[PDB]
Design a protein around this ligand. Structure first.
Ligand SMILES: Nc1nc2c(ncn2[C@@H]2O[C@H](COP(=O)(O)OP(=O)(O)O)[C@@H](O)[C@H]2O)c(=O)[nH]1
Ligand SMILES: Nc1nc2c(ncn2[C@@H]2O[C@H](COP(=O)(O)OP(=O)(O)O)[C@@H](O)[C@H]2O)c(=O)[nH]1
Ligand SMILES: OC[C@H]1O[C@H](O[C@H]2O[C@H](CO)[C@@H](O)[C@H](O)[C@H]2O)[C@H](O)[C@@H](O)[C@@H]1O
Lengths: 463, 470
């Protein structure tokens, strides 16, 4: 019997009664997993509509994915507990701590808010734990799949009630270096770990994340013993195993925005694509393109920055959008009017179409847990587009050889790579794109779900 | 042993001498070089460093191949000042500031918005190379007539020097000492490809690489392993095997120089009269964190019992204008004003001159000492202050200071980013009775006292030897 819980569900209630999940983001991923495994899933009720929906149906709400039909069991939290955790989680706290948003010299500075969110997080965690254990209460052997960085607190709680059941905690974001983790206040930095370690298996998308996690546990829990070879953690009589389970794309979930086809006609098209989130790094990308375009030969080339609006209420995300806009404008002032454009909407089909039309794809994240875009876009591109991929994406551990692996902070290197990519002829690119697509293709959602099960199974058996 | 010490500068002084109208050049004591002269196994010592005044430049021109300084104990040292191309020197200085290098090793970048490397990094890198060579050339050239020369290389700016020595002295013992932190592997990677590997290339050829703290060595090992797929690291032995050369990393903590150990700045005595004094002292550099300290102070005083309590921010100024420094000062002064405007007038004060006496007077007067650096290679103030404090002052110490690995058990140990913890620490420290404080201050001094400058020098000599022996 398999029980899967995910923090986040972006459902929309329109009329064809009609409830559906938004594509992209982790939510769709975990929902797809429920479809593969044929289960219910557990997630939180965000909006009032979600709260209303769960009240009417306690047994489960039914929604259609971007593909399939899944059955969610939403949780109604406290509307002040939950609203506050959805600040803690955000870059203000949790997001900034795992995706490297702090400079230390001037940010962060923790106060009373941190103790309060940390408490609310405890309530939010129990909310989830109680709800897993309940809907799994009539199960002789249950198997727990806990998905993500919000549900970090969860395994410790489950292990109390089900101390012999297999638990996988899977984190979809990076884990930072020990030194950076310590920035977090003491109760949080150890408390988070106290809740993760009781899991049978902790998984990430990349080795670097697993290594950083171990170094953290060794830096903060003295009565702990780690094995960098075995990727293991023994602590208070828990044996925890760390695993890399890379993920690429969903085969199933696979035309152009207004005026784009026209603007790009007879032009080489550079495409940056990513969420309105500072880590996607489109400011630096636009900057690096200007750098390439003074270095000439880039004529007849145009850049398109695809953004997907997301959490624009967090100052950072909206500042990122502003930084990017300013750069685009400055680029157009220097290189000539309409050289670069932004397209900032939420249509996932518009994005895939841009993946298709691209001559050069840039995925230069400052950091990224994986980046599924960098798998999808080659697998759909019809132009044999080159791919500039940052060394700091989890994906680079799988496709870095097959791509122009760049340092996301170096503009000169990013520009030179853009120049190189665009100077390559059709036959050179066709060749490269061919291999890229071969390196990408086998990393399917189905195959990742399998990797979770096979991993958990073997690790549970090695107790 | 024949010893060749290299560092950024050599502490020298000059007068006009009476009865000849002739310049006189001394060599103010307590220099790292003077201490090495005084050791056991060494026959003679030659010091190489950058010229940096019309005195330095003119002396170098007078004796281009070095001159022998006269020490106490009848010892002499050879001091060779390098006259670099000024433009090279200027750009290398800038390259070492928070504009680029300082932020790489002292954790100043948020990744999301800074940094963004341009052509400047490449220009700077090249000057760093030209400067590195200038040094390497000078070292070798004055160790030309030496059979088994021992090379001591100090300071971050001389990092590239070991590779350039081995090239010509493949069997010589070479110690490189780094006085600043070594950042995490993921953070080191932020640097542009040429620089991040470049630096490591120039370092590893040393026999021993030393830092002030374990965390630094570990972070360096993790960098190496992440960046040189050829290299091979051993955490247990703290040794690196790369291209047939085996490097050993040694943690050699330094606390203070006894030779360096006044009177309070104008108006400080009277302003602080019959008041408990909180002291924060550090250079005007972002990492010293003064302002998180002022904010933690407010947080503590708000909860009361900070009655009759006051706070002085000691700051040492910087000769150049570096933006990150200027912004830190703004941030501080804003925090100081918001504190005074809440706790009443003249509750907190900044004092901002360059005078090592005034600093010590402040150390002597302190009722509570704060050293909450965001990061710090060691922080030598946290040893000096307890050893000169006349009032059994407690110490709040960042867990991110190198010094914490030696003094953290003898101080109140803080996460320098957590304001609440810092405030609670301040409150506790100030609630203690004088006897409690006396005891904890005896222990604190007794743990600081051994870590002398001489003990540190010996640790290098001894460790380089042991490591050159395998
Ligand atoms: N709803 C929506 N989804 C998108 C859009 N563009 C891309 N996506 C999807 O969102 C995913 C992006 O994930 P990734 O690039 O790994 O970074 P993430 O944002 O952290 O998931 C991709 O798999 C796309 O299929 C868009 O404009 N709207
Ligand atoms: N030149 C100078 N030295 C100072 C001043 N204030 C303190 N110091 C000394 O500088 C040392 C502090 O160094 P530390 O905080 O470890 O970092 P550093 O600033 O890089 O040396 C202490 O031992 C003080 O004796 C000042 O205003 N000017
Ligand atoms: O601006 C550079 C600074 O370098 C030194 O500071 C380092 O060296 C100290 C000991 O020599 C350490 O205690 C300290 O942790 C390091 O930051 C120098 O002492 C400073 O004065 C310079 O400003």
């Amino acid at each position: 019997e398999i029980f899967l819980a995910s923090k986040r569900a972006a459902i929309t209630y329109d009329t064809d009664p009609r409830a559906w999940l938004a594509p992209g983001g982790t939510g769709n991923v975990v929902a797809e997993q429920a479809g593969v495994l044929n289960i219910s899933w557990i997630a939180s009720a965000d909006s009032e509509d979600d709260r209303r929906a769960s009240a009417l149906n306690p047994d489960g709400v039914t929604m259609e994915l971007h593909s399939r039909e899944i059955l969610v069991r939403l949780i109604r939290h406290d509307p002040a507990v939950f609203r506050n955790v959805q600040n803690f989680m955000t870059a203000n706290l949790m997001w900034a701590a795992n995706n490297y948003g702090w400079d230390r010299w001037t940010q962060p500075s923790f106060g009373s808010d941190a103790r309060e969110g940390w408490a609310d997080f405890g309530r939010f965690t129990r909310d989830f734990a109680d709800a897993i254990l309940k809907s799994s209460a009539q199960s002789a052997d249950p198997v727990y799949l806990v998905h993500d960085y919000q549900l970090v607190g969860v395994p410790a709680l489950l292990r109390e009630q089900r101390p012999d059941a297999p638990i996988l905690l899977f984190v979809h974001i990076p884990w930072p270096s020990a030194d950076y983790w310590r920035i977090l206040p003491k109760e949080i930095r150890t408390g988070i770990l106290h809740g993760m370690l009781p899991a049978t298996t902790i998984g990430f998308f990349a080795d670097r994340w697993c290594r950083n996690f171990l170094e953290s546990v060794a830096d903060l829990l003295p009565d702990a013993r780690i094995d960098r070879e075995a990727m293991t953690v023994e602590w208070r009589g828990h044996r925890t195993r760390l695993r890399t389970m890379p993920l690429g794309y969903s085969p199933l979930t696979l035309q152009l925005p207004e005026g784009i086809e026209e603007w790009a006609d007879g032009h080489r098209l550079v495409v940056h694509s990513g969420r309105t989130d500072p880590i996607k790094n489109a400011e630096r990308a636009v900057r690096a393109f200007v750098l390439a375009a003074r270095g000439g030969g880039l004529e007849k080339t145009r850049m398109l920055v695809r953004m997907n609006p997301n959490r624009l209420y967090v100052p950072a995300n909206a500042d990122y959008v502003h930084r990017v806009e300013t750069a685009v404008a400055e680029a157009n002032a220097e290189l000539g009017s309409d050289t670069v454009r932004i397209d900032n909407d939420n249509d996932v089909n518009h994005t895939i179409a841009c993946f298709r039309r691209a001559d050069l794809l840039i995925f230069n994240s400052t950091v990224d847990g994986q980046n599924l875009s960098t798998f999808e876009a080659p697998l759909v591109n019809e132009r044999d587009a080159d791919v500039i991929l940052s060394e700091t994406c989890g994906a680079a551990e799988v496709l870095g050889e097959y791509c122009r692996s760049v340092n996301p902070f170096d503009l000169v290197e990013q520009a030179e790579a853009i120049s190189a990519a665009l100077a390559a002829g059709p036959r050179q690119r066709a060749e490269a794109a061919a291999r890229r697509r071969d390196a990408a293709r086998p990393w399917t959602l189905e195959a990742w779900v399998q990797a979770q099960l096979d991993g958990l199974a073997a690790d549970h058996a090695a107790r």
